[PDB]
Amino acid sequence: MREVISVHVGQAGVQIGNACWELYCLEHGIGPDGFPTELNDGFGTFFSETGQGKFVPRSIYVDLEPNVIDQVRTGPYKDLFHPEQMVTGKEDASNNYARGHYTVGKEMIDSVLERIRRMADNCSGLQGFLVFHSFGGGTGSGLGALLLERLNMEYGKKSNLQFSVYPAPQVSTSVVEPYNSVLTTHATLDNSDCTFMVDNEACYDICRRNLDIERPTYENLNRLIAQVVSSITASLRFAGSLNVDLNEFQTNLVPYPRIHFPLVTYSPIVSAAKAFHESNSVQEITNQCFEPYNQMVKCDPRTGRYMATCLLYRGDVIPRDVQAAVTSIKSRRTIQFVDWCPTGFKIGICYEPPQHVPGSGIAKVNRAVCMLSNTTSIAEAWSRLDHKFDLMYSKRAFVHWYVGEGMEEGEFSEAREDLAALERDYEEVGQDSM
Amino acid sequence: MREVISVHVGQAGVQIGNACWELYCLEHGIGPDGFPTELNDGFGTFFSETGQGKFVPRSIYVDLEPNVIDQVRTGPYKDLFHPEQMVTGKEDASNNYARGHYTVGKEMIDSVLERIRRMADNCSGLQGFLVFHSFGGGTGSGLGALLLERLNMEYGKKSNLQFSVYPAPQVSTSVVEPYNSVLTTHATLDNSDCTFMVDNEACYDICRRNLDIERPTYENLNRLIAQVVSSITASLRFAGSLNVDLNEFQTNLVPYPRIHFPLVTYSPIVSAAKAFHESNSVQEITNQCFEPYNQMVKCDPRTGRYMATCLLYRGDVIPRDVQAAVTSIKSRRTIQFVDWCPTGFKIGICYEPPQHVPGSGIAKVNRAVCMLSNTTSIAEAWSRLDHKFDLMYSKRAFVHWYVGEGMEEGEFSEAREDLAALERDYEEVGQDSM
Amino acid sequence: MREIVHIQAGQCGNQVGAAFWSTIADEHGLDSAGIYHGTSEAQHERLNVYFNEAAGGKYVPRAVLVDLEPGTMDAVKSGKFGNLFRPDNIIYGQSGAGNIWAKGHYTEGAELADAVLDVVRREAEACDALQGFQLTHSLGGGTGSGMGTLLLSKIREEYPDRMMATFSVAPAPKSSDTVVEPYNATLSMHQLVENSDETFCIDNEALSSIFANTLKIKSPSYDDLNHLVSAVMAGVTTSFRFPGELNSDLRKLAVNMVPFPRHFFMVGFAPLAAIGSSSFQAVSVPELTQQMFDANNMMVAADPRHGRYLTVAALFRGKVSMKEVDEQIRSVQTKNSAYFVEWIPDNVLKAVCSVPPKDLKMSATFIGNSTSIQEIFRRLGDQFSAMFRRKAFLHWYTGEGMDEMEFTEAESNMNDLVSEYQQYQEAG
Amino acid sequence: MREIVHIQAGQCGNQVGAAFWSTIADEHGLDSAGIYHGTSEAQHERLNVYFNEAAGGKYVPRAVLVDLEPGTMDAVKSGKFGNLFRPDNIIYGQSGAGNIWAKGHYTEGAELADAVLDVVRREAEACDALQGFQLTHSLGGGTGSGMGTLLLSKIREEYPDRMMATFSVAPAPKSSDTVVEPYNATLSMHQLVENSDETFCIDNEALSSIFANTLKIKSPSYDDLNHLVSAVMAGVTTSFRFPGELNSDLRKLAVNMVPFPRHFFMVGFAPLAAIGSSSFQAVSVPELTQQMFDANNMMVAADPRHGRYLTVAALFRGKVSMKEVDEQIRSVQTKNSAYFVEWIPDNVLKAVCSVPPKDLKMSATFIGNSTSIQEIFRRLGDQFSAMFRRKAFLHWYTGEGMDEMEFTEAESNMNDLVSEYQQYQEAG
Ligand SMILES: Nc1nc2c(ncn2[C@@H]2O[C@H](COP(=O)(O)OP(=O)(O)OP(=O)(O)O)[C@@H](O)[C@H]2O)c(=O)[nH]1
Ligand SMILES: Nc1nc2c(ncn2[C@@H]2O[C@H](COP(=O)(O)OP(=O)(O)OP(=O)(O)O)[C@@H](O)[C@H]2O)c(=O)[nH]1
Ligand SMILES: Nc1nc2c(ncn2[C@@H]2O[C@H](COP(=O)(O)OP(=O)(O)O)[C@@H](O)[C@H]2O)c(=O)[nH]1
Ligand SMILES: Nc1nc2c(ncn2[C@@H]2O[C@H](COP(=O)(O)OP(=O)(O)O)[C@@H](O)[C@H]2O)c(=O)[nH]1
């Protein structure tokens, strides 16, 4: 029934879903115990129902700590999952790719791959599957890149989307974020169909200004990423006006099979007192979604030229206010060019109003915009990595703790090389002549 | 919709608007919380409405103190503005032009210039914009002259009106009022389309006689300047008899691009017991508006000859009592001549009766007159400055505190020079022969 | 949020804290225990200036009380208000200063300077934005006169944009403390002029005239003396520390005053009365202005009638207009027009603050500039040089590490000041 | 379930148990009697680490208290907490060690090593999955310095995957215990570097500076000394032993730190105050970060200002954001940018744990790496070699079974360490 399943690897991938499924349960009238209900196809979208009326969130959980996973069974969602799907690991050596890849994380895979299997044995209309991890993780970067490479080895043509999160230009969470993150874009290069990545320090930068909270937390950043998920997924789980499929993105974002790193821009994100004294019409939002204040990734998309961008709108939207807005962006100097598409857009309309969770300080709105922007500038955080990662490798710093876990440095020899073609690819698209 | 926006820089520009918008909220039936209403186009004139029914006063606030700005959020208008538009500064070095211009005030500009931008993105019928500052301020003189010079650099043909206030012939508020005021007429010479200026000690002189209060305050002077604003602006925001646009002034006051310093004369200003025992007909007012007792600027407009003068009438007015009055002024000896316009008038009629705020001791009236008078005498307060300012510069008094903030004295070398051409311009218009 | 970190030095340089800090707490509605008790909501929006916020409302006074001898330091510790200051900022040495300048400036403070700067640095960057620093000390002694100056020159070598403002107290014309009080005064001025901007000069003997001439008490003590001159430290920040209509700041009170880098001017109060002299007046601005005219309401032991007013700033608090000051300033600038400086027409600065002080409907703070502050230094200079002719008490300085001709330099430094004030007494 | 078995050695190497174990019980809500008394449900899900479950809630501390002389062993037996440890794991010999290394390393421990390993083996395989082993001992003595090292090398020859982590205490720069304390230090480092990964170095004299400089007590005793440095053994497992938001483990704190097999770095606390210095602050992360900067809050008797920071991990507990650390770490990494190592941009590790300690709203544990830990060993090496020139006290070692040139080897072992830290002080 046009259904898809979301894996969760890495301690980020734990807590990301703890906002995603919270939004998912509120976007269908699902009680937190799974036994719901204090559209027609909507009531069975992400959920393989039992006749008891409660239903399983079609997910999985992968972690090698028992620490953060068992917080869920302590937490209020103790009846949501089931203790087969929630596969833990008894021990861990995280921040260690090549044993989370090649030694310790591989012992979970045959237990993991079985649970992929039977959940693919009910979802008759299967639309690929969804991947959550981080780069700041070891094992989520580690097992996650290993997770795709056998699944796309199995499932062939099936869809492979992932929302990633990478170490910031300014604040790391660990020193291994040069090392045990930048190599994982090898396996996820040719196994992820499309992918998406986001910055904490950019998302924190939104929190001090558009949320205006001095001391936020992960959870508020978790809630902000989570609506971008349901802006894409649950839009086809609701009968809109111009429906947008999952498969439409991966054919409306890449001219070439490598270039599948768009942006994320979500708007309006408006604080409590800020929604009052303000009318946020649709062009009032879209003039913000090209300004860097609502920008998810700490980069310079102003300087680069945009390539192709799909948009997703929620709530009460007319296409006339789209075309009155979008004819002003293409006129405006703040974008200059695409050469390879004289249109460069994909417009999509779903009627479901933006869901407003009660706890956090986000404010309610009657219209929404999600933006997935390909550009000629996003390789600079990659070039940040090349400035970083080639410096660490100019000293050979615990190559032993990449070697002693069971892998020679030939992939580190391959590491910047595949990165170099990524830099070469954006200047290749940067070639704009006759 | 023929709409315009008013900036507020300087501590004068703070408190001036606190009378202006108070008058604005009473002249449309706007509750003080913004949520109004305890003409047709009138209900959306200065105001970009939200669907909630409260609406934003299209203004901005610029100050480098947090002191007087935060009095508003303490004060009763705490829900009127919104805390983006009200941009403060965390620290200040005021009475210091060339760091309020060149060091400390410039760090706010990119935050300011963004808020100019989006408010220009809803006001489809834009008629330039309005500027409030002072000369007795440092930073309002400082950032204000800097505020115009990029906006008129951006907006080109757009209208630039400002109501200024200059240091008196007799009572200063600071010693820097020779220094950090008289230079600001450089940048505002070629960036202000028209401008207007007024004296406290002249406006205080009205308060002891026409208001008859021994101890007034700024607030009463704020209320008196404020009706001159709405006599010009809200006259086109009301369906009158012979409508007067903002653009009509700047083409009916200047024969030459420099000469844009008219007078202000507002009448009747009549105390409480004075309105009783008195009928103030329209020619009873216009015979007062050429007498120096209701005169806003402590100068000698009797001695000088008038150049060209537009008039604005409020309330129940016939043009026959205009022409019966105005044929007596041109007959009377107390004006002698224009040479360059044998008519020298512009008449304008709006029906809206004069708004009477409850608190202050001003009295209600059923007809009103506003006067904008160009003359051959207004350069004498400028000549007061040349008597003052060339004396300070005959000692070089904290040139260091013009230098150490980051500007050489070449503009002080230019200071009297541009002033000298202003004096040269009035004798140039003073040339009246064949 | 435009904030100040406070520095004291010397015995009586530390005595002024209690007259300062108990008033500024009372001016901000704050108890001995530090926890909050205030009536209006008016006294908060600029409360952050002289106070670092704390856990549980404690609101610590940002101060560092500095001394060389532990005599008087425990007195405010063991007395009352022993829970206002945090004792990490209480530092003090044990060996005596002997109130000898280079003993206090050059060498014994150098035993304690290494502990000084690591205190004020972590205080500085924990502030939002420094407005400036206050140094209150003595000119006559050794600890406040010496150690704070070396303390100053390091800070002025660290924060060249941040304003340095100092209070100090004068040698007396007649009621002097010690005999090296000439040397300490000259040596203190060698660092005040070169490093900091502004310094004010308060004679204790002219302060002793105030309760003698005006308040009519035969026998006041120092806890009444500092209590009076406290409120000008309140008065200079009265404009600043809670709202009003117009008011400016000490940096704005710096650039308006002097046309040169040479910054010294006067201090006075308004109003002022005796015990039984309280209710027999009509307290108002004409009552205020005339106690802003005499030398009798001043602090400097020098005649403005011998001098000439360079620039004037007035700082009112209370319900007060402008025209009540305007018509009154014009009433006294005309009869005393030769008393003004003709380099500047209208050197008057007006600043109107809102709330009144305790039990007084109005209050004003006097800032007027002079040419006759050389009447200090001429009275200093021949008091200085006559104790150089025989090299008086010279071995208590060169027996500590300073060259004698370095002491001769500060004479010309004093004479470089007077050479300008020679001119603007009668020139132009 | 990621668990640790504990090993002590030596007199003061056994003294640290009570400061450890009474805190970790109190950190886990556990009494003297062993039976459970805890408030929250937060303190259970990782309780299994330092404790083997028992019958009737007893919850035995997994520990083996090891010594060569029965002087101080009965003291914690006959004192309080005599029912925490199980006496099967209490082993101790009777003949004196004489605190001579090879007497304690090579021969008298070999009388007791056969009873050692059969204790820890049955402890090991009764655990679920070993996370690692802790060795706490001395560098200066003989029992802890000698017998634990031979004890270590057998365990590292049995469990090559399992992490070996050690705590030890330094010889003093000035307040030394004995005169063979140079020899014991060199000989201990010959086994620490070769077998185990990480070792930390705590000067008692710098620890004596802490209550002297910071907490202001003239006369603390060792039961206050170990009580302070206890909580870093709590602090390194603070991240681990109950939940949070991010936290990693000691093996994850091993691979992030050093780019080589050469593992030594520093220890400090946050916050820290005196008795009356408690409430006069605002305890927060800017309060935390500056007590994570000075050498005064460190433990090593070596200057980070003489050194350079290789890598930094920070371990917070309490309500704490990231940006409060982020903006503050950026505020101090910029002014001290030359103090970092330019081999690695952003060598900062952040880890945020949940619950606060007893009566303190926040707490932080300092891990910073240095180049100037050679300032120990250079101070050791010439303290070592000068007592080799005349073969000082040599017959109390070669009169026990070790060749003298085997003692010469450990000099180059020390010099092999310094040769690298010679480079990264100034290279790259
Ligand atoms: N849980 C969580 N992690 C986040 C969040 N935002 C960013 N992160 C990153 O997620 C990474 C978490 O992975 P780890 O720190 O390695 O924790 P872990 O259990 O060892 O994760 P694995 O390495 O995959 O086992 C961190 O590096 C952070 O940079 C968030 O909101 N929640
Ligand atoms: N607020 C206010 N100011 C007035 C009024 N009338 C005249 N002024 C002048 O406005 C000036 C106010 O600016 P400032 O005194 O410098 O106060 P400020 O906050 O430092 O202003 P900036 O220099 O722009 O920052 C004063 O010098 C007065 O001379 C009035 O009615 N209200
Ligand atoms: N502020 C103040 N100063 C005083 C008072 N009484 C005396 N003085 C002066 O303050 C100085 C006190 O000397 P002292 O503080 O010991 O000098 P020190 O060496 O710097 O500490 C002397 O120069 C006195 O002239 C007083 O009550 N208040
Ligand atoms: N941990 C700790 N060590 C101490 C203390 N006091 C002294 N020491 C050091 O610990 C060692 C005590 O010697 P000892 O335990 O007998 O050495 P042993 O031969 O290995 O048992 C000496 O090297 C002292 O320098 C203390 O309070 N705590």
PDB file of C-alpha atoms and ligand atoms in Angstrom, chain A residues 9-16 63-65 68 92 94-95 134-142 165 172-174 177 200 218-219 221-222, chain D residues 245-248 252, ligand 1:
ATOM      1  CA  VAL A   9      21.407   3.088  13.413  1.00  0.00           C
ATOM      2  CA  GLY A  10      23.608   5.186  15.625  1.00  0.00           C
ATOM      3  CA  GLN A  11      22.827   7.059  18.809  1.00  0.00           C
ATOM      4  CA  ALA A  12      21.694   9.916  16.617  1.00  0.00           C
ATOM      5  CA  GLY A  13      19.508   7.444  14.753  1.00  0.00           C
ATOM      6  CA  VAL A  14      18.044   6.490  18.097  1.00  0.00           C
ATOM      7  CA  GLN A  15      17.022   9.943  19.217  1.00  0.00           C
ATOM      8  CA  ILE A  16      16.098  11.233  15.766  1.00  0.00           C
ATOM      9  CA  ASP A  63      22.821   0.261  18.297  1.00  0.00           C
ATOM     10  CA  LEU A  64      25.685  -1.474  20.014  1.00  0.00           C
ATOM     11  CA  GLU A  65      25.034   0.160  23.338  1.00  0.00           C
ATOM     12  CA  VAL A  68      20.105   4.699  25.013  1.00  0.00           C
ATOM     13  CA  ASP A  92      30.362  -1.802  21.792  1.00  0.00           C
ATOM     14  CA  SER A  94      32.149   2.875  18.914  1.00  0.00           C
ATOM     15  CA  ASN A  95      34.069   5.733  17.239  1.00  0.00           C
ATOM     16  CA  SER A 134      25.143  10.136  11.629  1.00  0.00           C
ATOM     17  CA  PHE A 135      28.675  10.942  10.630  1.00  0.00           C
ATOM     18  CA  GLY A 136      29.518  11.976  14.174  1.00  0.00           C
ATOM     19  CA  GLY A 137      28.754   8.442  15.231  1.00  0.00           C
ATOM     20  CA  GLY A 138      31.259   5.715  14.889  1.00  0.00           C
ATOM     21  CA  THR A 139      28.943   2.751  14.560  1.00  0.00           C
ATOM     22  CA  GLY A 140      26.067   4.602  12.948  1.00  0.00           C
ATOM     23  CA  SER A 141      28.615   5.764  10.445  1.00  0.00           C
ATOM     24  CA  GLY A 142      30.122   2.296  10.718  1.00  0.00           C
ATOM     25  CA  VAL A 165      24.167  14.701   9.996  1.00  0.00           C
ATOM     26  CA  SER A 172      32.896  18.739  16.798  1.00  0.00           C
ATOM     27  CA  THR A 173      31.496  16.108  19.066  1.00  0.00           C
ATOM     28  CA  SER A 174      34.567  13.891  18.644  1.00  0.00           C
ATOM     29  CA  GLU A 177      34.925  13.002  12.786  1.00  0.00           C
ATOM     30  CA  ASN A 200      23.920  21.031  14.347  1.00  0.00           C
ATOM     31  CA  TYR A 218      19.350  17.723  21.108  1.00  0.00           C
ATOM     32  CA  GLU A 219      15.631  17.091  21.499  1.00  0.00           C
ATOM     33  CA  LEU A 221      17.093  19.792  17.166  1.00  0.00           C
ATOM     34  CA  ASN A 222      15.510  16.368  16.896  1.00  0.00           C
TER      35      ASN A 222
ATOM     36  CA  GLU D 245      22.444  12.190  26.209  1.00  0.00           C
ATOM     37  CA  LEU D 246      25.706  11.424  24.437  1.00  0.00           C
ATOM     38  CA  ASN D 247      28.244   9.713  26.598  1.00  0.00           C
ATOM     39  CA  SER D 248      31.089   7.415  25.593  1.00  0.00           C
ATOM     40  CA  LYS D 252      36.254   5.497  23.496  1.00  0.00           C
TER      41      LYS D 252
HETATM   42  N1  LIG E   1      21.617  11.212  19.704  1.00  0.00           N
HETATM   43  C1  LIG E   1      21.869  12.332  19.035  1.00  0.00           C
HETATM   44  N2  LIG E   1      23.072  12.504  18.382  1.00  0.00           N
HETATM   45  C2  LIG E   1      23.303  13.641  17.701  1.00  0.00           C
HETATM   46  C3  LIG E   1      22.339  14.615  17.641  1.00  0.00           C
HETATM   47  N3  LIG E   1      22.794  15.638  16.916  1.00  0.00           N
HETATM   48  C4  LIG E   1      24.028  15.325  16.504  1.00  0.00           C
HETATM   49  N4  LIG E   1      24.368  14.116  16.999  1.00  0.00           N
HETATM   50  C5  LIG E   1      25.626  13.446  16.696  1.00  0.00           C
HETATM   51  O1  LIG E   1      25.427  12.054  16.758  1.00  0.00           O
HETATM   52  C6  LIG E   1      26.614  11.405  17.125  1.00  0.00           C
HETATM   53  C7  LIG E   1      26.180  10.251  18.021  1.00  0.00           C
HETATM   54  O2  LIG E   1      26.905   9.076  17.788  1.00  0.00           O
HETATM   55  P1  LIG E   1      27.953   8.659  18.918  1.00  0.00           P
HETATM   56  O3  LIG E   1      28.410   9.910  19.598  1.00  0.00           O
HETATM   57  O4  LIG E   1      29.155   7.956  18.365  1.00  0.00           O
HETATM   58  O5  LIG E   1      27.166   7.784  20.007  1.00  0.00           O
HETATM   59  P2  LIG E   1      27.227   6.215  19.779  1.00  0.00           P
HETATM   60  O6  LIG E   1      26.256   5.403  20.588  1.00  0.00           O
HETATM   61  O7  LIG E   1      28.624   5.733  20.015  1.00  0.00           O
HETATM   62  O8  LIG E   1      26.840   6.244  18.236  1.00  0.00           O
HETATM   63  P3  LIG E   1      27.523   5.107  17.377  1.00  0.00           P
HETATM   64  O9  LIG E   1      28.938   5.464  17.069  1.00  0.00           O
HETATM   65  O10 LIG E   1      26.790   4.962  16.085  1.00  0.00           O
HETATM   66  O11 LIG E   1      27.465   3.851  18.198  1.00  0.00           O
HETATM   67  C8  LIG E   1      27.429  12.479  17.838  1.00  0.00           C
HETATM   68  O12 LIG E   1      28.727  12.538  17.317  1.00  0.00           O
HETATM   69  C9  LIG E   1      26.787  13.814  17.564  1.00  0.00           C
HETATM   70  O13 LIG E   1      27.643  14.556  16.747  1.00  0.00           O
HETATM   71  C10 LIG E   1      21.134  14.424  18.251  1.00  0.00           C
HETATM   72  O14 LIG E   1      20.303  15.313  18.213  1.00  0.00           O
HETATM   73  N5  LIG E   1      20.902  13.295  18.973  1.00  0.00           N
END
